[PDB]
Design an enzyme around this catalytic site. Sequence first.
Site, PDB file in Angstrom:
ATOM      1  N   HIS A  19       0.807  -1.209   0.000  1.00 53.21           N
ATOM      2  CA  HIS A  19       0.000   0.000   0.000  1.00 53.21           C
ATOM      3  C   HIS A  19       0.847   1.269   0.000  1.00 53.21           C
ATOM      4  O   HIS A  19       0.391   2.297  -0.505  1.00 53.21           O
ATOM      5  CB  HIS A  19      -0.950  -0.051   1.187  1.00 53.21           C
ATOM      6  CG  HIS A  19      -1.934  -1.172   1.101  1.00 53.21           C
ATOM      7  ND1 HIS A  19      -2.469  -1.784   2.212  1.00 53.21           N
ATOM      8  CD2 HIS A  19      -2.460  -1.810   0.026  1.00 53.21           C
ATOM      9  CE1 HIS A  19      -3.292  -2.744   1.826  1.00 53.21           C
ATOM     10  NE2 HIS A  19      -3.305  -2.780   0.504  1.00 53.21           N
ATOM     11  N   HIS A  42      -7.788  -8.378  -7.653  1.00 58.69           N
ATOM     12  CA  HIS A  42      -8.031  -9.229  -6.484  1.00 58.69           C
ATOM     13  C   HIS A  42      -8.212  -8.259  -5.320  1.00 58.69           C
ATOM     14  O   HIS A  42      -7.263  -7.976  -4.576  1.00 58.69           O
ATOM     15  CB  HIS A  42      -6.868 -10.213  -6.243  1.00 58.69           C
ATOM     16  CG  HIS A  42      -6.667 -11.220  -7.341  1.00 58.69           C
ATOM     17  ND1 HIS A  42      -6.293 -10.876  -8.623  1.00 58.69           N
ATOM     18  CD2 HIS A  42      -6.730 -12.573  -7.323  1.00 58.69           C
ATOM     19  CE1 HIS A  42      -6.178 -11.970  -9.357  1.00 58.69           C
ATOM     20  NE2 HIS A  42      -6.428 -13.015  -8.588  1.00 58.69           N
ATOM     21  N   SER A  93      -6.513  -2.129  -0.241  1.00 57.12           N
ATOM     22  CA  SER A  93      -6.244  -1.431  -1.496  1.00 57.12           C
ATOM     23  C   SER A  93      -7.464  -0.719  -2.087  1.00 57.12           C
ATOM     24  O   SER A  93      -7.289   0.399  -2.596  1.00 57.12           O
ATOM     25  CB  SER A  93      -5.611  -2.396  -2.523  1.00 57.12           C
ATOM     26  OG  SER A  93      -6.436  -3.508  -2.851  1.00 57.12           O
ATOM     27  N   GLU A 111     -13.684  -9.171  -6.871  1.00 56.07           N
ATOM     28  CA  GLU A 111     -13.446 -10.070  -5.755  1.00 56.07           C
ATOM     29  C   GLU A 111     -14.349 -11.282  -5.940  1.00 56.07           C
ATOM     30  O   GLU A 111     -15.556 -11.121  -6.156  1.00 56.07           O
ATOM     31  CB  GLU A 111     -13.722  -9.373  -4.420  1.00 56.07           C
ATOM     32  CG  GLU A 111     -13.795 -10.330  -3.241  1.00 56.07           C
ATOM     33  CD  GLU A 111     -12.502 -11.088  -3.049  1.00 56.07           C
ATOM     34  OE1 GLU A 111     -11.420 -10.471  -3.138  1.00 56.07           O
ATOM     35  OE2 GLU A 111     -12.554 -12.307  -2.824  1.00 56.07           O
ATOM     36  N   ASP A 136     -13.631 -13.303 -12.045  1.00 54.69           N
ATOM     37  CA  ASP A 136     -12.210 -13.610 -12.085  1.00 54.69           C
ATOM     38  C   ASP A 136     -11.406 -12.359 -12.407  1.00 54.69           C
ATOM     39  O   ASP A 136     -11.602 -11.730 -13.453  1.00 54.69           O
ATOM     40  CB  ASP A 136     -11.964 -14.701 -13.124  1.00 54.69           C
ATOM     41  CG  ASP A 136     -10.510 -15.123 -13.213  1.00 54.69           C
ATOM     42  OD1 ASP A 136      -9.741 -14.881 -12.262  1.00 54.69           O
ATOM     43  OD2 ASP A 136     -10.133 -15.716 -14.248  1.00 54.69           O
ATOM     44  N   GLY A 137     -10.492 -12.005 -11.501  1.00 55.37           N
ATOM     45  CA  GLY A 137      -9.699 -10.802 -11.686  1.00 55.37           C
ATOM     46  C   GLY A 137      -8.768 -10.866 -12.881  1.00 55.37           C
ATOM     47  O   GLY A 137      -8.528  -9.847 -13.535  1.00 55.37           O
ATOM     48  N   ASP A 157      -2.974  -8.558  -7.235  1.00 56.10           N
ATOM     49  CA  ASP A 157      -2.623  -8.886  -5.847  1.00 56.10           C
ATOM     50  C   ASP A 157      -3.293 -10.183  -5.404  1.00 56.10           C
ATOM     51  O   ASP A 157      -4.049 -10.217  -4.430  1.00 56.10           O
ATOM     52  CB  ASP A 157      -3.007  -7.715  -4.939  1.00 56.10           C
ATOM     53  CG  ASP A 157      -2.569  -7.916  -3.489  1.00 56.10           C
ATOM     54  OD1 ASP A 157      -1.584  -8.639  -3.227  1.00 56.10           O
ATOM     55  OD2 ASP A 157      -3.246  -7.359  -2.614  1.00 56.10           O
TER      56      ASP A 157
HETATM   57  N1  LIG Z   1      -9.489 -15.392  -9.460  1.00 60.09           N
HETATM   58  C1  LIG Z   1      -9.741 -14.449  -8.548  1.00 60.09           C
HETATM   59  N2  LIG Z   1     -10.333 -13.279  -8.966  1.00 60.09           N
HETATM   60  C2  LIG Z   1     -10.620 -12.260  -8.089  1.00 60.09           C
HETATM   61  N3  LIG Z   1     -10.301 -12.424  -6.761  1.00 60.09           N
HETATM   62  C3  LIG Z   1      -9.718 -13.564  -6.338  1.00 60.09           C
HETATM   63  C4  LIG Z   1      -9.420 -14.606  -7.206  1.00 60.09           C
HETATM   64  N4  LIG Z   1      -8.838 -15.589  -6.475  1.00 60.09           N
HETATM   65  C5  LIG Z   1      -8.769 -15.195  -5.178  1.00 60.09           C
HETATM   66  N5  LIG Z   1      -9.342 -13.953  -5.089  1.00 60.09           N
HETATM   67  C6  LIG Z   1      -9.404 -13.036  -3.953  1.00 60.09           C
HETATM   68  O1  LIG Z   1      -8.111 -12.418  -4.007  1.00 60.09           O
HETATM   69  C7  LIG Z   1      -7.862 -11.749  -2.776  1.00 60.09           C
HETATM   70  C8  LIG Z   1      -6.367 -11.680  -2.462  1.00 60.09           C
HETATM   71  S1  LIG Z   1      -5.985 -10.636  -1.012  1.00 60.09           S
HETATM   72  C9  LIG Z   1      -6.374  -9.066  -1.829  1.00 60.09           C
HETATM   73  C10 LIG Z   1      -6.044  -7.885  -0.908  1.00 60.09           C
HETATM   74  C11 LIG Z   1      -6.310  -6.478  -1.453  1.00 60.09           C
HETATM   75  N6  LIG Z   1      -5.750  -6.278  -2.795  1.00 60.09           N
HETATM   76  C12 LIG Z   1      -5.729  -5.436  -0.497  1.00 60.09           C
HETATM   77  O2  LIG Z   1      -4.611  -4.964  -0.706  1.00 60.09           O
HETATM   78  O3  LIG Z   1      -6.369  -5.044   0.481  1.00 60.09           O
HETATM   79  C13 LIG Z   1      -8.733 -12.490  -1.757  1.00 60.09           C
HETATM   80  O4  LIG Z   1      -9.697 -11.570  -1.291  1.00 60.09           O
HETATM   81  C14 LIG Z   1      -9.389 -13.618  -2.557  1.00 60.09           C
HETATM   82  O5  LIG Z   1     -10.706 -13.937  -2.174  1.00 60.09           O
END
Ligand SMILES: Nc1ncnc2c1ncn2[C@@H]1O[C@H](CSCC[C@H](N)C(=O)O)[C@@H](O)[C@H]1O
EC number: 2.1.1.266
Length: 270
Positions: A19, A42, A93, A111, A136-137, A157
């Site tokens: 961050h 993500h 984030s 998410e 899917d991210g 992430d």
């Molecule tokens: N294919 C996918 N697409 C989107 N999210 C996913 C994913 N696989 C896992 N995740 C999600 O990815 C996240 C990783 S932790 C993300 C933390 C955030 N970026 C921050 O900085 O606060 C988790 O919440 C998990 O549920």
Amino acid sequence: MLSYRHSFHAGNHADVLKHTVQSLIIESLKEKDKPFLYLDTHAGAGRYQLGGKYLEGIARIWQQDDLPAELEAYINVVKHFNRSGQLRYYPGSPLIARQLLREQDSLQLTELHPSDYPLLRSEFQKDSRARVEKADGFQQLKAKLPPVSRRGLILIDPPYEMKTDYQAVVSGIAEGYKRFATGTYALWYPVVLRQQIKRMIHDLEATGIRKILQIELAVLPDSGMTASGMIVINPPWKLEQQMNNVLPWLHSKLVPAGTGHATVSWIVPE
Ligand SMILES: Nc1ncnc2c1ncn2[C@@H]1O[C@H](CSCC[C@H](N)C(=O)O)[C@@H](O)[C@H]1O
């Protein structure tokens, strides 16, 4: 899959480095009035109730009297969610971006976890700059790029719960970069298995993408997670010097015993 919950790790040393870098890139993008996109593949739940790895992360910096200028934007968001002076909530984030981005900017957040997606949606129910999808991210690196603004920070992430993430982040960056080669891409990674990180970086070099910076903070030497990093494609021109300014202070506060390291170097130099 999808057993990972970021609430267990929120505000740890990895989030502090991640961050910090995210905030500095956003502040650089804000130097020009033209709008930009923040894309979070993500995104997590948005905010996290802390009360404990955060005790060895954000708790060690947010109230320091000699906070470096490079941390002010980030720590002011953390203070915004904790005005009592007690550390109770950590902004993820998406909330760092929600507070730092301007009226003209846009947010695209994804998410997949079925309990954390609705929490993330609630954080943006009155923010028309943002779109929040349960999807899917990695697909968003195809679907949401390039932004019509032609400016952006893309934060990738994943949790690396599925070992496929080590290859998916490289493929995904390649697809995003093809659509939007001038964007700034910030990839977070953990160091649990150094050789798999070296393998990943090798695959990334093989894409031919240029101007790739690596920022790493280790709390212990290579051996669970001993370090994490941010790989930044198209860093803002100030980012390397900002990290050289702030990493010694950050490592000394996050790791008072001095173990590990804090480095900034180039994977593909200019
Ligand atoms: N294919 C996918 N697409 C989107 N999210 C996913 C994913 N696989 C896992 N995740 C999600 O990815 C996240 C990783 S932790 C993300 C933390 C955030 N970026 C921050 O900085 O606060 C988790 O919440 C998990 O549920």
